[PDB]
Amino acid sequence: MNIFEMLRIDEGLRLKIYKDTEGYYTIGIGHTLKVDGNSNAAKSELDKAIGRNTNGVITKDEAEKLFNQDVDAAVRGILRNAKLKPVYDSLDAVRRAALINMVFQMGETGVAGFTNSLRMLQQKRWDEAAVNLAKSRWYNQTPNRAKRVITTFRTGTWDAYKNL
Ligand SMILES: [Cl-]
């Protein structure tokens, strides 16, 4: 079980443009449209990333391509980020996966911002960090998912995602 599986569950699939809890338009597997207003607007953007008049509807494969891109992009940021890289290099797979998930959902520069919590994972101080993240707007914004991502960090296992 990997990161792809992990985010599938954490973000779900949608083949027709939609608005998330956060308000933003979304499509595929949690692939957001960093676009303001009108769905149209959203669409244009989509169409752009897709290279076709889409009408806010895409195929599964098109959804898969975006997924792949976004992930590679999460990973590439961690790999090029001087603040995240050391940490990453430090964890176990599972724990790396958790790392990705966060960058994936919140961006490399958002993650890089958990200064102290990053330190704690880096010093294998699981619970402390665990607990530390538990404040956070992040956590506070999406409690179930974070919960999941946090437990992973905590236990270093795939329990949180087990049967689903
Ligand atoms: Cl996607």
Domain ranges for the chain: 1-164
Beta bridge partners of 31: 27
User: Known catalytic residue: 47?
Assistant: no
> What six digits make up the tokens of 119?
């330190």
Q: How far is it, in rounded angstroms, from Cα 28 to Cα 35?
A: 16
Please tell me the distance between residue 148's alpha carbon and the centre of ligand 1 in angstroms. 20
Which residue in 38, 72, 33, 35 sits closest to 50, CA to CA?
33
CA of 154 to the centre of ligand 1 (A): 28
The alpha carbon of 8 and the centre of ligand 1 are apart by a number of angstroms equal to: 9
- H helices within the chain, ranges in order? 3-11, 39-50, 60-80, 85-90, 93-106, 108-111, 115-122, 126-133, 137-141, 143-155
- Contact between 9 and 2 (Cβ < 8 Å): no
Residues 6+ apart with CB under 8 A from 14: 26, 27, 28, 29
Instruction: Extract the annotated binding site for substrate.
Output: 104, 117, 132
The catalytically annotated residue of 20, 36, 72, 127 is 20
Distance CA 152, CA 160 (A): 7
CATH of region 1-164: 1.10.530.40
Question: Which method, experimentally, gave rise to this model?
Answer: X-ray
22 tagged catalytic:
no
- Phi, psi values for residue 57, rounded to 5°: -120, 130
Is the Cβ–Cβ distance between 27 and 43 less than 8 Å? no
CA–CA dist 88, 44 (Å, integer): 36
Quote the ligand 1 centre to 19 CA distance (angstroms): 14
Rg of the chain taking only CA atoms, in angstroms: 16
By three-state DSSP, how is residue 143 classified?
Answer: helix
Structure tokens at 123: 């010093």
Decide: helix, strand or coil at residue 17.
Answer: strand
- Buried b / exposed e over 115-132, threshold 16 CB at 10 Å, is eebbebbeeeebebbbeb
Tell me how far apart the terminal alpha carbons of the chain are, to the nearest angstrom: 11
Residue 58 in tokens: 């895409």
